[PDB]
Every structure is written in structure tokens, then in C-alpha cells.
Design a protein around this nucleic acid. Structure first.
Lengths: 417, 50, 100, 48, 50
DNA sequence: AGACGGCTGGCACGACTTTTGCCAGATCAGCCCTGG
DNA sequence: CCAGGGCTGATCGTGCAAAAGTCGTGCCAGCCGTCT
């Protein structure tokens, strides 16, 4: 070869300030978009039972104080009490350390023992052992309360005391040799412990809202299901007529010009927002066509795809499709998904075919869940199971996936039958 | 006071406030751009009515 | 509570729209003229003593135009809520009370 | 028996404890009326 | 703060006798409010926060 | 009790996706000025 | 009075490519189950 400064050929590229703004325009959500678009509308002048129910509710923390009021105590005890039950979660254990609470008092007289008292007084209130300060003892408090008469009590009390690590790593072989408990009788002690309500505060608050706005819609009319955009959601600008009919007859150059410039802007912006929409519908549509599959079938039946796959079905560039897919959610019979979502990595199976990781990762989740609970399936054992299916994933892939689904290991999910 | 839960839809108390706020914002943004007298007078009349 | 600047002046509908007219009884101005000047369709005159024009009189758009073309830039006038504010602020109360 | 927030809890405490004593304070509806009147261009306040 | 008088300072009221009424002034309205609103946006549906 | 085998997870290294960053210019048509 | 020349402005333009990011799979270290 040789080094020189010659010239090449054959290409195509063009851009401008205003067009740029028109292009970034479809990369951001309608709700966050409509904001940007309201702002345009201030700048451009030619472009356009009182309390019902209001039922105040309980709230747990609010519940804790109602009994604080009718507990008897001093002003210092009622001050620390407000401090303590101030700092308590929806779950119900306390957020701050107890020595921290002492720093919140800012009093020389106040002592840890004094705090130990007011705390424990309000530690068995409603519901049981709440304001825990790190569960272990919360369990120990609920144990505390009920009668001696129930068997296996001392057993559950021994384990819960200082053998927590033993129970969290589910190493019952070690548990047996350490605690020197009964073989497959301890099981029922552990079952007692199991039914004791960890997270006793949660209970109170339950009233949680409904909240998600689908951008596009897709819905099984006779087969060949068809996409239509969300009418209510879609933003729309409409020309002001008054001001349109006040540019010509205008007597001054200032005014006349003024009105022309704005109309120019405005017509352009309309046309640009109009563009956003069309793209996105054309595109919605083109992604669900290929992914016909998936709606009926499930997460398993998803074909593995890349943007290229969906860009070459349209005439637009890849990046463009990438900008229009971000944060749009499209509602379907099956549920609400982000449009991003469809797109994933492939892996190569037997028979030349490829499989979407998403679908394999859905597959792994069903397979792992639906197994004998005495013998957990390890990752590699699964790799082998999948290979029967044809997937030929490898073991770290599967670990990756198996740990992504927020599911812990096999030796760690082993339990007593 | 959300009716369906998805949209709160504040009515009879925040609609007029919203109206007045956006109209005053548009008027204050247009008064600095050297707008003609007719447009700014119509915007002021609309803000007065709101 | 909160506050809004509202750079543009705005009248209070509780006054001058009840059974007695407060702005009316303060400026000795009829209700129709105030209702027409609070909507940029009356163009009332604020001040000007050199010209042959009254202090509180109605001058229509064509009237204000032919007044400004003849008397020049002397008959200053306002057509918004600021007109009532200027007519009510630059007016002494003790002298008017003594006259009444 | 009214919207007085700082009085209901105190009365409940006095009844559970057996005190039978009332602390009127001030209803919240009067404060709501004051705020709604102040929402317009009319000043209003209470002296001493 | 000693955390023993702050809670008692909340539950406190004055005589409130002889309530009067008069016209409002822009200075009084500015003194009554702490902040100024500028956007008609009430609530967001992405995170449900002010 | 010690060695062997299995398990998991961190980290690395290519093959491969995707996400952000550009910034006019020339060309055509109607109206006004001027020559025929 | 009619045709020729000048000049301004109105109009058209959603991609190519460079770097950051993710992906899958392998390599190696460290813990734990089991037989000798």
C-alpha cells in the first residue's frame, strides 16, 4: 500500500439547526413532550362537591400514636416516644439506630437504658412487635407473646436466637450438628417460625392506586390484530385563525413581518409533530407484525430480533427507529409493555434456529420453579435440560439469566419436604 | 380526588387556575417580544375575562 | 397559600359589579363606560389639560385616532385596566371630599 | 364533636382517663373560611 | 431544639378577639405567600411527585 | 480428617448493538424596475 | 403600454457515522459435599 491524501466518493448527508430540533422531537415521551410543546405555545401567539369524599385514613404511624396518647408516661417519655415511632417504616422496623435516636434527643440526661425502656413499652402495641430495629428480635417478640403450652417452642427460640445464619443459607446439615436438634422433627419448629409474620407493619396500608398510560393500542380483531394509536394521548396543534387573518391587512412592516415569521414557525412545528406520530405508528405497526407470535403464545414464543430487523421492514434508518421507540408503552390484551422490550439478543440452538434470550429466560423460570423441592436443579443440570430442548445456551449464560430473574441458586433454595 | 385512579382530574378549583396561569405566562412571554398592539390587547382582555 | 405576579393589571369583579359601583362612586363614572373600558374597547382619556378635552370622557377608536392626529402626542389615553388605576391613583381625596 | 383536631384526641384521653374536661381551642372550618376569604383581594385577620 | 417545647409550641392559640376586615395590599399578599407559581402543571404521572 | 469434584460468581475479551452528535445550502417563482 | 431582467424570499430537506455499550461465553478462584 501507500500513504497519501486522495479523495473518495459515493455518500449522502445533510442537516440544519431547525431540522435537528425536529428530529430530537420524537425521542421523548408524550407526557414529557407535551410539556415541551406547551412551552412553544406560550412563545407562539398564532398556534393554539368541594371535598368529594376526602376520607382521612389510618396510616400505621398514625395508628401508633393514637395508642401513644393513651398510654400513660411523662413528657420526656412522650417526647422520646414521638421520636421513636416517628422513625418507623411501612414494613414496621425502625430506620434509624437507637444510638442515633439519642443524638436526636440532644439531652445529657437521656440515656440508652431510658430509651430501651420507652421503646420496649411501645414495642408491643399494635400490631405485635413493630419498631423492631433489625428482625431477628422482631420474630423473638412475637414468639414471646403466646403460651408455653405449644410444643417445639424452645426449639424455635434456640434457633431464632443465634442461629439465623444457619437458617438463611438453608444449611440444615450444619444446623443439626450445631444446635444438636432432632432429625426431621426440627422441621416442625422451623414451620412454627415460618408462620410468624416478618414485616407485621405492612398490613395497615393496602390502598394502592391504578397508574399507566399506554401510547399505542393492539387488539385481536378476527386475527391479523391491528395497531391504532392512542387518541386521547396524542398531542395536537391547530392554527389560530384570528391571527392568520390579521397578517395581510396589517398596515406596518413590524406587524406584518411579525406575523409571517410566526406563521412560518408554527406551520413547521405542526408538521414536525405530525411527523413524530406517523413514524411511531408505522413503526409500532412494523414491530408487532413480526412479533405476531408473541401475543397469543406467551413470552416463550418471541423471535429473537435486532433493530436492523425492524428498520429494514421500514424505509427509515436504524437510529431513527431507536429514538422513536424510547419510552413509549403500547397497551395490548396481554398487558402493558415498553416498546423497547421486544428487541433482544438471540442465541443459536440445534437445527440452525435461534432463540430470544427473553423467551429462554422465561423458559428457565418455569422450569426451575416447577421442580422437586427436595432436589433443586443446578444451572449446569439445566443447561443440559435445555440442550434437550435444543437451545445449547452454556452454563454462564444460564447463571446470568437465572440470577437476573432475581432467583437465588440451587444449593441455596434447597428445603425440607 | 382521583375518580378512576389513573387521572386525578382536579375540577372546579384548578381548571380556572390553570387557565389563568398559562394565559398570564403567554402574555408575559409575548409582551417582551415587541408584539403588535392588537394581539397584546386581545391577550390582556382574555386574561381579564379569565 | 401562594401568589401570582400577573404583570398585567386586573380589576376585582366583586367591586363595580355589585348593586353599588365602588369605582363608579369614586371616579363619578357611569357603569357602562367602566364596563366598556375594562375590555380594551373604549379607550378612555387619562389626563391632558392643554387640549380641549374633558378628564373623564369616552373617546372611541376612530375618535382617539383623530384626536391624536390633530392634537399630537398630548392627549394621552389608556384602554386597559391600567386606565382605571391611573384615574383612581392620581386623584386627591380630601379636595374632592371638600368639594362634595 | 366537631372538626377541632387538637380537641378530639384530648377529649378521648380525658374520657378514657375519667377526667371529663373540655378544651375548645378553635375549629378548623373557621381557618378554612379565613383562607378562602384571603384567597381574594380582601384582607382579614383577628386582633388581640 | 430541646424536643420538649417544640411539640407544645404547636398546640397553641391566641385570644383572636375583635376580628376585623379591610382591603388587601400587594405587599400583604407577597408577605402571605412564600413562593411564586409559574407552571400550570399540577402532578406528574411518571413518578407521582410534586 | 484430608483430598477430589462440583458449584458459583467475578473478570476478561472479541463479536456485535445502539445511542448520540450533526447544523445549508442552492434553486425556483412572483413582483418591481426599466427598456422597447 | 407591453415585454425583459433582477432580486428577494419562499421551499425542500428525518439520515451517516463515530464512539459507548451490551452480549455471550470462556478462564480461574474460592466454598462446600462426600469418600477414604
Amino acid at each position: 500500500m501507500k500513504q497519501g491524501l486522495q479523495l473518495r466518493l459515493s455518500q449522502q448527508l445533510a442537516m440544519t439547526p431547525q431540522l435537528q430540533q425536529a428530529i430530537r422531537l420524537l425521542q421523548l415521551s408524550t407526557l414529557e413532550l407535551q410539556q415541551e410543546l406547551q412551552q412553544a405555545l406560550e412563545s407562539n401567539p398564532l398556534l393554539e362537591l368541594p371535598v368529594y369524599q376526602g376520607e382521612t385514613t389510618q396510616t400505621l404511624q398514625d395508628y401508633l400514636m393514637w395508642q401513644v396518647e393513651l398510654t400513660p408516661f411523662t413528657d420526656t417519655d412522650r417526647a422520646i416516644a414521638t421520636s421513636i415511632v416517628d422513625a418507623v417504616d411501612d414494613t414496621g422496623y425502625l430506620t434509624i439506630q437507637i444510638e442515633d435516636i439519642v443524638d436526636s434527643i440532644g439531652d445529657d440526661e437521656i440515656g440508652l437504658e431510658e430509651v430501651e425502656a420507652v421503646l420496649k413499652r411501645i414495642q408491643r402495641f399494635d400490631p405485635v412487635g413493630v419498631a423492631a430495629k433489625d428482625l431477628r428480635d422482631c420474630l423473638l417478640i412475637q414468639l414471646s407473646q403466646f403460651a408455653k403450652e405449644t410444643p417445639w417452642l424452645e426449639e424455635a427460640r434456640l434457633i431464632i436466637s443465634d442461629h439465623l445464619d444457619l437458617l438463611a443459607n438453608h444449611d440444615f446439615r450444619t444446623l443439626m450438628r450445631v444446635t444438636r436438634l432432632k432429625e426431621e422433627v426440627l422441621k416442625e419448629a422451623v414451620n412454627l417460625i415460618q408462620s410468624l409474620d416478618p414485616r407485621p407493619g405492612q398490613s395497615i396500608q393496602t390502598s394502592e392506586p391504578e397508574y399507566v398510560i399506554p401510547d399505542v393500542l393492539v387488539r385481536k380483531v378476527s386475527g391479523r390484530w391491528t395497531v391504532e394509536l392512542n387518541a386521547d394521548s396524542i398531542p395536537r396543534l391547530k392554527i389560530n385563525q384570528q391571527y392568520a387573518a390579521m397578517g395581510n391587512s396589517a398596515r406596518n412592516d413590524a406587524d406584518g413581518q411579525f406575523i409571517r415569521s410566526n406563521l412560518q414557525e408554527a406551520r413547521w412545528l405542526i408538521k414536525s409533530l405530525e411527523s413524530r406520530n406517523d413514524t411511531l405508528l408505522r413503526v409500532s405497526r412494523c414491530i408487532v407484525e413480526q412479533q405476531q407470535a408473541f401475543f397469543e403464545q406467551g413470552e416463550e414464543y418471541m423471535k429473537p430480533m435486532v433493530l436492523a430487523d425492524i428498520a429494514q421492514a421500514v424505509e427509515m434508518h436504524e437510529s431513527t427507529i431507536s429514538r422513536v421507540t424510547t419510552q413509549k408503552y403500547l397497551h395490548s390484551p396481554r398487558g402493558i409493555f415498553e416498546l423497547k422490550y421486544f428487541f433482544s439478543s438471540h442465541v443459536n440452538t440445534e437445527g440452525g434456529g435461534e432463540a430470544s434470550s427473553t423467551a429462554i429466560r422465561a423458559l428457565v423460570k418455569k422450569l426451575i420453579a416447577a421442580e422437586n423441592p427436595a432436589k433443586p436443579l443446578s444451572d449446569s443440570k439445566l443447561t443440559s435440560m435445555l440442550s434437550e430442548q435444543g437451545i445449547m445456551v452454556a452454563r454462564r449464560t444460564v447463571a446470568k439469566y437465572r440470577e437476573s430473574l432475581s432467583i437465588p441458586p440451587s444449593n441455596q433454595r434447597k428445603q425440607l419436604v | 380526588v382521583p375518580l378512576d385512579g389513573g387521572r386525578f382530574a382536579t375540577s372546579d378549583l384548578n381548571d380556572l387556575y390553570r387557565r389563568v396561569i398559562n394565559r398570564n405566562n403567554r402574555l408575559k412571554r409575548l409582551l417582551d417580544l415587541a408584539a403588535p398592539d392588537i394581539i397584546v390587547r386581545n391577550e390582556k382582555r382574555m386574561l381579564q375575562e379569565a | 397559600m401562594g401568589h401570582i405576579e400577573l404583570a398585567s393589571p386586573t380589576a376585582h369583579i366583586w367591586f363595580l359589579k355589585s348593586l353599588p359601583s365602588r369605582i363608579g362612586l369614586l371616579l363619578d363614572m357611569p357603569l357602562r363606560d367602566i364596563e366598556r373600558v375594562l375590555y380594551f374597547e373604549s379607550y378612555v382619556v387619562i389626563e391632558g389639560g392643554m387640549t380641549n378635552l374633558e378628564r373623564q370622557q369616552i373617546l372611541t377608536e376612530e375618535q382617539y385616532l383623530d384626536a391624536l392626529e390633530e392634537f399630537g402626542d398630548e392627549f394621552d389615553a389608556k384602554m386597559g385596566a391600567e386606565a382605571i388605576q391611573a384615574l383612581l391613583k392620581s386623584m386627591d381625596l380630601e379636595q374632592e371630599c371638600e368639594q362634595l | 364533636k366537631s372538626d377541632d383536631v387538637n380537641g378530639r384526641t384530648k377529649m378521648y384521653k380525658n374520657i378514657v382517663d375519667g377526667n371529663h374536661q373540655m378544651e375548645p381551642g378553635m375549629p378548623e372550618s373557621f381557618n378554612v373560611l379565613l383562607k378562602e376569604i384571603r384567597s381574594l383581594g380582601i384582607n382579614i385577620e383577628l386582633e388581640d | 431544639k430541646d424536643l420538649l417545647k417544640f411539640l407544645k409550641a404547636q398546640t397553641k392559640t391566641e385570644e383572636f378577639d375583635a376580628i376585623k376586615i379591610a382591603l388587601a395590599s400587594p405587599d400583604m399578599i407577597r408577605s402571605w405567600s412564600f413562593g411564586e407559581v409559574k407552571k400550570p402543571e399540577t402532578i406528574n404521572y411518571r413518578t407521582f411527585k410534586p
